Amino acid sequence: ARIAGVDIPREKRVVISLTYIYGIGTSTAQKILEEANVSADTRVKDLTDDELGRIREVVDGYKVEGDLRRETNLNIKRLMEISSYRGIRHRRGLPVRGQKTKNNARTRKGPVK
Amino acid sequence: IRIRLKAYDHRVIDQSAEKIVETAKRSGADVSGPIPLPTEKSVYTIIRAVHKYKDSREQFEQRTHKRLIDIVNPTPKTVD
Amino acid sequence: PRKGSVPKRDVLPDPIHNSKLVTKLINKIMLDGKRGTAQRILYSAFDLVEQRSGRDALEVFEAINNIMPVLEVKARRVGGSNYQVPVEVRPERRTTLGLRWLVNYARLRGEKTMEDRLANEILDAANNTGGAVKKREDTHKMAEANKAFAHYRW
Amino acid sequence: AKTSMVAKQQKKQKYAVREYTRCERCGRPHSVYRKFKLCRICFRELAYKGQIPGVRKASW
Amino acid sequence: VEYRGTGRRKNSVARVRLVPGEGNITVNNRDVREYLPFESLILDLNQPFDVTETKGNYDVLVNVHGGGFTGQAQAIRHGIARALLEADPEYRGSLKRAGLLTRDPRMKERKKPGLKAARRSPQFSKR
RNA sequence: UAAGUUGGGCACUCUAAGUUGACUGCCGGUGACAAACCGGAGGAAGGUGGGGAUGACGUCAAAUCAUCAUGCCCCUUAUGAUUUGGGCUACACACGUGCUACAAUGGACAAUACAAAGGGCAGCGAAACCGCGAGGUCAAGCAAUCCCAUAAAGUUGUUCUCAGUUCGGAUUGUAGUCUGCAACUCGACUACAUGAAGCUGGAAUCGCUAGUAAUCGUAGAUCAGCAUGCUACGGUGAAUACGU
């Protein structure tokens, strides 16, 4: 419904809708919604009238909102450029952490091979 | 004193049980004698270091043979 | 009609089916010598079996007409070579083989509680579609459909 | 396992730094003294009622 | 010592591996109150036990061999009774009032050839 | 009546820390010229108590300079050696082996009642510090005890619901443990994120008897980076023979 604006998955697992949404990889999908009678029978928007409201209150009350967590993650990129690590001179080229440039190719970052 | 008596083998503990009763007899106080110690142990084999067929670690056994003969009222002549 | 069998000496009186198979299935699926408790665990969903079905549970427990090892291929290495030959089951062996056939070859599909799905898998089991009922046709396909040798009896 | 701990105390094999020297026949390996084969706990019981001239009070 | 106990009751001998101390009686390794077919006197099934005064002082953990529907019941009680005889000599003198040694002086007679029950016969069949 | 019992050596058990009866030997039992061992009440000890231990002289060097002696060998500013540029793990993995999640006749995670073989003056824990976890407690006693006991079943979670769902102790990478100097160019635990393939299974092979095989509990001979394999016995230990 209005959980992410335009519901990607439709007519499927209730916790499968949080799988397509970035920020969670089905590790805390059933650890965020703890409302009364918060079950699921393969019906995200089916057999349900009021349940997303409580899920939107626990997702906003949590430390990570959903875009601010990725905002700081996409803002530390230049913050980790103090002659340290975090692919300082790795992402620019093709080599990535693990030195797999000799073992094989650059699957991490590779323009054309 | 409530002290044990760990000698070597069976006769080694037998001669130590009569020798401790002699030294305790010298002192002028109550002395004990025989001490019930029902047999109870186990055995096992493994490997050593070089070559020595079976029965690893050339030793007699893991028997916990001991005793409990001592003195009750130790005086100044109880040292001998 | 083998006169010589294995010394069985077993008892299974049942006052719910008036026979010796209901208690035989209560002693086949029994664990840690559970007799009285077995009935309690069998009557725990017994009412649900006749409530989640349109037929009579007593006669349903028509689902027992497709779980018998008609002719299972056993092990006799015939003629000095390692080969497999099928054998015929005995009346007092197929009943005990099929009784626990759904208690070991029907544990991959379950739902709801722990004793209501047993009847759920029990219903629509005659029609080949399950796993424990798939061994019935697998038994005849392991001995008859593929021709083999039969002289090595046991 | 006190009998198995009172047995393996000075076992000398390939490594002699594995055996731990403790109470010869008694227990209480800690909170005592070990240097000349005489633990305080054992010595106290071995000097009970003034046995061998060892258990004293002070007297400078 | 209270193992390998000999106790026969109407052709129903059964050995008992009773252990001193623990009192976890688990006949057939489970419930023994809802197993016996009949046995109305489930609590009064052990008559010598009362005089033995060792109800919760020994764990059965044994089994039953042969016997009948209710003939297999009240057989482990004598099985542990003989096991208590070797476990303590005081029991023998403690159960001198009762002293159950044999309680099977007859068998079970039913349908038979020639005679009805090989002893009785039909007499004036009621009309 | 402090599982460091604080007692009364208070009453003796189930008792530890030298063995014992017992086992052939008449035995109930007759071999026919003929004992007997089985087992009868035999004692708890089904009979060497139950039992084991036992490596008889050997055979294969099959193995050993890299298991060493040596018929003895291999480097002489390099095969050593005070030791970094740096190592046989991280790439397709080609196997044995390391547990593993493939399911509702059920998952991770509550409190949690009950032996242990062994560990310990620096180290074990009752609500407490340590109850998802990899650890940062000094420490009562300081080793029959005391600690593991927050172990286990016949007596219990939960919960997500014919499945990728709160079912996945794989990879991967900032990073906490173990070591971070030789991992830049050699290991991992469970997590802040990644958490695969995976619905009983390959080429091919391996496994099954009421205090024990197994199994809730479960174990090291131990290297300054691998414990995730059987490894200790109180009780869950439920089951035991068409056929010679």
Identify which of E57, E39, E41 has the alpha carbon closest to the alpha carbon of residue E94: E57
* Token pair of E94 as six digits: 């403690």
C70, C42 Cβ separation under 8 angstroms: no
* Token pair of E78 as six digits: 């004598």
Please state whether C86 falls in left (phi above 0), alpha (psi between -120 and 50) or beta.
beta
Identify which of C45, C38, C60 has the alpha carbon closest to the alpha carbon of residue C125: C60
D35, D22 Cβ separation under 8 angstroms: no
CA distance C114 to C8: 32
Are C37 and E34 inside 8 Å of each other by CB? Answer: yes
Q: CA B22 from chain center: how many Å? A: 16
Secondary structure element (H or E) that encloses residue E59, with its range: strand E58-59
- Experimental determination approach used: cryo-EM
Nucleotide lying nearest to C34, CA to C1' measure: F238
Q: E88: which residues sit within 8 A by CB, 6+ positions away?
A: none
Contacts of C37 in chain E (CB under 8 A): 30-31, 34
DSSP collapsed to 3 states, D1-60: CHHHHHHCCCCCCCCCCCCCCCCCCCCCCCCCCCCCCCCHHHHHHHCCCCCCCCCCCCCC
Closest partner CB to B6 (pick from D25, D45, D50): D25
CA distance B42 to B19: 29
Q: A33: which residues sit within 8 A by CB, 6+ positions away?
A: A51, A54, A55, A58
Beta carbon of A113 within 7 Å of strand F? no
Identify which of C121, C10, C117 has the alpha carbon closest to the alpha carbon of residue C63: C121
Beta carbon of B39 within 7 Å of strand F? yes
DSSP annotation of B71: B
> What distance in Å separates residue B14's CA from the closest CA in chain D?
18
Are E30 and C34 inside 8 Å of each other by CB? Answer: yes
Secondary structure element (H or E) that encloses residue E19, with its range: strand E19-20
Q: CA A90 from chain center: how many Å? A: 24
Using the structure, give the distance in angstroms from the CA atom of B47 to the C1' atom of F230, rounded to a whole number. Answer: 18
CA distance E84 to E105: 24
CA distance D14 to D11: 10
Contact yes or no, B with A (3+ CB pairs under 8 Å): no
Are D51 and B73 inside 8 Å of each other by CB? Answer: no
| Buried/exposed A33-44: b ≥16 CB within 10 Å, e otherwise | beeeeeebeeeb
Instruction: State which residues between 85 and 124 of chain E bring their CB within 7 Å of strand F.
Output: 85-86, 88
CA distance C121 to C101: 12
Smallest CA–CA distance from D42 into chain B, residue: B3
Identify which of B26, B4, B22, B1 has the alpha carbon closest to the alpha carbon of residue B13: B4
CA distance E39 to C135: 43
Cα angle, residue E67 at apex, residues E66 and E68 outer, rounded to 5°: 125
For B43, B48, E53, E96, the CA distances from B51, given in Å and listed in that order, are 21, 7, 61, 66
D37 annotated to bind ligand: no
Q: A9: which residues sit within 8 A by CB, 6+ positions away?
A: A16, A17, A19, A20, A44
How are beta strands E19-20 and E58-59 bridged, if at all? antiparallel
Are C33 and E28 inside 8 Å of each other by CB? Answer: yes
Residue B19 forms contact with D (CB below 8 Å)? no
* Token pair of E86 as six digits: 């070797």
C35, C26 Cβ separation under 8 angstroms: yes
Place of tokens 């037929």: C55
Taking one residue from B and the other from D, the number of pairs with CB-CB distance under 8 angstroms is 35
* Token pair of C112 as six digits: 């709801």
Nucleotide lying nearest to B66, CA to C1' measure: F17
CA distance E57 to E76: 15
Q: B27: which residues sit within 8 A by CB, 6+ positions away?
A: B71, B73, B74, B75, B77, B78
* Token pair of E81 as six digits: 């009774």
Residue D57 forms contact with B (CB below 8 Å)? no
Identify which of B66, B74, B65, B76 has the alpha carbon closest to the alpha carbon of residue B31: B74
Residue B12's SS3 state is helix
R_g (Cα) of chain B, nearest Å: 18
Instruction: State which residues between 85 and 124 of chain C bring their CB within 7 Å of strand F.
Output: 103, 106-118, 120-121
C23, C39 Cβ separation under 8 angstroms: no
CA distance B1 to A107: 79
Burial (CB count <10 Å: 0-12, 13-18, 19+), residue C111 = exposed
Resolution of this model in Å is 2.9
For A89, A94, A110, B18, the CA distances from A113, given in Å and listed in that order, are 20, 11, 7, 94
User: Nucleotides on strand F with an atom closer than 7 A to protein CB?
Assistant: 9, 14-20, 43-45, 53-56, 67, 90-92, 102-106, 116-123, 140-145, 153-155, 159-167, 172-175, 184-186, 193-196, 199-200, 210-211, 222, 235-243
Smallest CA–CA distance from E32 into chain C, residue: C36
C132, C118 Cβ separation under 8 angstroms: no
CA distance C102 to E84: 45
Burial (CB count <10 Å: 0-12, 13-18, 19+), residue C132 = buried
